[PDB]
């Protein structure tokens with residue numbers, strides 16, 4: 001069995017290997033990369049996502065989100081307070097202001113210590129989940145807006161024909177902006193490209209041990225657990241590496257830098273934070289190996305998780321017994 005310790009693997013494809021996306025995902029799996037829940041892919045030196053970023057300040061963040069925390073430093077939840085619209089130029093200036101800028105630090109490890117110590121005492125503002133793409137249309141390799149769609153995958157593997165679309169999303173981050181512990185909708189894969197700016201630190205639990213994390217989360221957030229049998233679908237709970245280690249939960253960590261891709265694998269729980277002003281692009285995708293995970297994915301029916309249009313068909317086809325209850329939570 002490849003990668004039995006479930007380490008995060010890092011890949012350096014050649015320009016030739018970068019042509020066929022699906023093939024390279026299958027390659028990484030042949031080497032055991034999925035067992036970690038997360039892999040890093042460093043593009044060949046000849047590749048570029050786009051010519052320059054010199055023109056991105058005009059993008060609009062229609063609903064910036066202020067991430068307010070409650071709890072203790074290692075075990076907290078965050079809620080998103082909506083703020084007035086602002087341009088990327090406005091947001092970058094805010095990120096770099098004395099109130100929000102990254103503090104002096106020695107190295108990534110020092111900065112990680114400062115994040116876990118102090119996160120809860122601040123409320124950073126995140127421009128998340130913005131439909132759009134920063135890949136040049138002429139970039140043919142690993143262009144996240146030109147992937148094969150999840151609908152097409154389900155049609156090819158299962159023969160059924162469904163509505164729905166699959167487009168990328170932009171994320172504008174600043175110091176301490178935080179992504180809570182989650183798997184993807186329908187336990188899909190994700191791919192994330194860091195276009196520019198400061199790094200993103202990731203934490204991940206191997207898919208084979210996801211239920212260990214869920215059991216700890218039920219213990220640590222007991223009112224939330226009573227409210228919903230899949231409350232991590234709400235994407236609000238944070239648990240630190242120190243707390244994970246105290247409770248024996250297997251995990252790994254890695255820091256993504258600008259120019260790098262990360263792939264999350266089906267049912268790979270992940271969480272993390274941004275080091276300073278940055279911009280990422282991400283999208284969900286499927287492969288044939290995902291279908292079994294889609295069929296078994298948990299679902300929130302309490303009403304909190306509210307998701308895209310396109311998840312309807314996935315539930316309806318893969319989880320018909322759950323469909324009626326889940327759709328009530330949508331409506």
Ligand SMILES: O=C(O)CNC(=O)C(=O)O
Pocket residue numbers: 171178179190191192264270280282283
């Ligand atoms: O970058 C972020 O804030 C969060 N991204 C993801 O959870 C992902 O790409 O799957």
Ligand SMILES: [Mg+2]
Pocket residue numbers: 055056057058059
């Ligand atoms: Mg612009």
Ligand code: NI
Pocket residue numbers: 182183184190264270
């Ligand atoms: Ni994710």
Ligand SMILES: [Zn+2]
Pocket residue numbers: 227228229230231233234300301302303304305
């Ligand atoms: Zn719920």
